[PDB]
Structure 1
Amino acid sequence: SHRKYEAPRHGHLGFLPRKRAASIRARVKAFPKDDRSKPVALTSFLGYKAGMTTIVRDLDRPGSKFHKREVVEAVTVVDTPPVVVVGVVGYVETPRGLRSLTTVWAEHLSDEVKRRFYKNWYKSKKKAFTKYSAKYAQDGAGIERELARIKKYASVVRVLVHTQIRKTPLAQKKAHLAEIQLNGGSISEKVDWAREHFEKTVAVDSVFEQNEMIDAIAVTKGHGFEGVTHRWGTKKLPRKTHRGLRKVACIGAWHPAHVMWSVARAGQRGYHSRTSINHKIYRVGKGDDEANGATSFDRTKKTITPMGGFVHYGEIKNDFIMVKGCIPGNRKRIVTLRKSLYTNTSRKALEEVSLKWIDTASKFGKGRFQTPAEKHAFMGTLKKDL
């Protein structure tokens, strides 16, 4: 018989299976559509989620109750040092899908990316790419041959870029390597861009700009095995329930004489790949630039790092992308920021934000002071110092 009371389905069936992602770095499953009149540029970037903070900005939204008024907004800071281009991959289109034709690597690779090819780096002989580096022996005839193959073919060109976690405060020491699709014209000159950028760094200010809506692709925070009550949000069974109440009462009708795939069941929660779109960049601040956290209204000579460091991450010393709101993944996790796949014109996009103040109080508690100078000014002299 029928349900006797309608309710919407618990959970989303398009995010199945709720399994652990196959890797800690989420895969970019789609790149922005290639406009072959624009200059060659990376379509995405790699960074590390540092943490969240708070900003103040004047809302520019005509017709809104808070138009020309001040809004307090949560933002996520993603530490994005420049990525090193170490290779180029060519993709020919086939009746069975896209297919890698050949990959051309840079002559010299840093230990960061070489560590990616070893489970046990400390006891290896570090032979990686040692015979490949002989392809550049005299003039690189073999290397130019492979690059010519990419130009004669390979309707899709992706560069191999790796992060530099030696610049982040992370202890990992093993860089993340990813393919970034090159958008822009003349596939031949896509390869030209890649080759001239071998062993070179590309900074995030050449990929992303202020106010742009981007997508963050990351593996969510893992939570292990979870019951149906929190994994799917099903109603808690009454307190009177024998055998437990954090369950789903009926997991299926008599027929079909099977448990259906759509029934909420206990299993792994979190550690899923997610692609969340339309996150607006609020700052493209530079690591060399002191006063990262300063605005045209604030002017305090302070970095974006909160007092005492980003909790569980550390300090920001590189270029960072500050996006509005929250993005998937936890602190210290590799994230991929990609350009939006479509042209958004909604007055939520196209909005020009100017930050008025960036919160740099300690996240290790109820932070009271934006800078140590303010603490000294407020507190006066202490017994230890000050």
Structure 2
Amino acid sequence: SHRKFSCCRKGNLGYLPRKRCTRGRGRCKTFPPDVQGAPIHLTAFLGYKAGCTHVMRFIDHRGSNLHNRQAIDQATIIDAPPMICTAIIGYAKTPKGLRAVTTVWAAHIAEPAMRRFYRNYFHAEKTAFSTYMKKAADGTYIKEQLGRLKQHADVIRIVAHTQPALTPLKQKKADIMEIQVNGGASVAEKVDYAYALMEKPISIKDVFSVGAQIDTISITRGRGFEGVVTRWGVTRLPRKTRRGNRKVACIGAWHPANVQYTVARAGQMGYFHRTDTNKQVFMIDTAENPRCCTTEFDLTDKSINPVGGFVNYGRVQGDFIMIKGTCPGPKRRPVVMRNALLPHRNCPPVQLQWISTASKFGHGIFETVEERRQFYAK
């Protein structure tokens, strides 16, 4: 007979199966669409999650109760040391989909990439690219391959890698990513632009801008094996139940004589590949600037690094980006940033007035160590 009262199912069936991610890191499945004639630009970057904090801003939002006053907002900091371009890959559109044409590697490759090619660098015999680097000493081979790409490709991407030596991480091998080149008037313009920045650093300042929106892709926090109450959010059973009350009472009808895939069961929770969309950029700066986080209402110079350090993360050494809200993952998890595909239309402009830099280790009340020393008669 029919269920007496109305209620929806619990959980989203579009995120199945709930299994540990088998991809090494967060990967960019799709890139923003390419429109001919727009200025040529890059579409993505890779960084590391560092922390969260406060900001006070001024809201100019016509038609809302916030239109002429202040608001306290949550922000997230992502550490973005420069990336090195090192290869060019071209694709051709085909009846079978996107097929690679060829990939051309630079004459000289840095140690982090070489490390990425092995499992144990100290013991491994160093043979990767040993023959290739002799062939490509002169520019002739590179030119021939780029001519091939110019005459046969439809989509152009570059290959860049991170520099973990500029971070507090323990890892020494780098992360290799493909980044698409959008814009221009033809494929030749794209190929020349990509060739103009080979073996060169790329800064996040040249990819994103303040006030635009981005998508973030990462892997969420892990929890191991978990029960239905926490894994799927079903109701607990009453106290008098024999054999406990954290479970689903009925897991099916008599017919069909099987268990359906739509019924909640226990298993792995967390460590999933996820993507949050439409996050607004608040600030792009570098930790090498002493007035990094000083505004019109402040006096003493304050930088990004808080008093006592970023908890469970080293100190930030260089460039970084600030976004509004939250992103998946814990601290130190690699994060891929990407231009938004379907941005939100009505976003008020960003107008920072004050940034909180107190100690997040405990409850701190001093924005700088000099103020603390003054206070404690030190």
| TM-score, normalisation: structure 1 | 0.94
Letter in 2 for 1:324: K
CA-CA distance at 1:92 after TM superposition = 0.9
Report the more deviating stretch, 331-340 or 195-204: 195-204
> Is it true that 1:96 corresponds to 2:93 in the alignment?
no
Deviation at 1:220, TM superposition (A): 1.0
Q: Determine whether 1:11 maps to 2:8.
A: no
Matches within 5 A, 1:1-386: 1-138=1-138, 140-185=139-184, 186-342=186-342, 344-346=344-346, 348=347, 351-380=348-377, 386=378
For 2:322 and 2:302, locate their aligned partners in 1 and report how far apart those are by CA, in whole Å.
16
After superposition, the C-alpha distances for 1:225-263 in whole angstroms (9 at most, x for unaligned) are 111111111112222222232222222222222211111
1:95 Cα deviation (Å)?
Answer: 1.4
Number of residue pairs aligned between Structure 1 and Structure 2: 377
Counterpart residue identity of residue 340, structure 2: S
Q: What's the CA shift for 1:271?
A: 1.1
How far apart in 2 are the matches of 1:257 and 1:192?
A: 63
Amino acid at match of 1:174: K
* CA distance in 1: counterparts of 2:141 and 2:359, whole angstroms: 55
1:299 Cα deviation from its structure 2 partner: 4.5
Give a deviation string over 1:60-103, Cα, whole Å, max 9, x none: 21222122211111111000111111111111112121112211
Deviations 1:112-141 (A, max 9, x none): 122111111221133222222123223x32
Q: Residue deviations 1:283-330, cap 9 Å, x none?
A: 111232222222233243121111111111121112111100101111
Greater CA deviation, 24-33 or 119-128?
119-128
**Post-superposition shift, 1:173?**
1.5
- Counterpart code for 2:86: V
CA distance in 1 between counterparts of 2:187 and 2:237 reads 60
> Over aligned residue pairs, what C-alpha RMSD do you find?
1.5
Letter in 2 for 1:361: A
Q: TM-score, normalised by structure 2?
A: 0.96
1:258/1:194 CA distance change after superposition, 3 Å: same
The equivalent residue for 1:383 is none
Query: Which amino acid letter does the alignment assign opposite residue 121 of structure 2?
Result: W
Contact 1:92 1:156 in 2 (8 A): yes
- Structure 1: runs of 5 or more not aligned: 381-385
What is the DSSP-based 3-state SS (H/G/I as helix, E as strand, rest coil) of the residue aligned with 2:168?
Answer: coil
Q: Secondary structure at the match of 1:131?
A: helix
Moved more, 42-51 or 93-102: 93-102
Query: What is the alpha-carbon distance in structure 1 between the residues aligned to residue 2 and residue 145 of structure 2?
Result: 65
Determine the C-alpha separation between the residues in 2 that align with 1:292 and 1:256: 64
Segments of 4+ moved more than 6 angstroms:
none
CA contact (8 A) 2:57 2:354 kept: yes
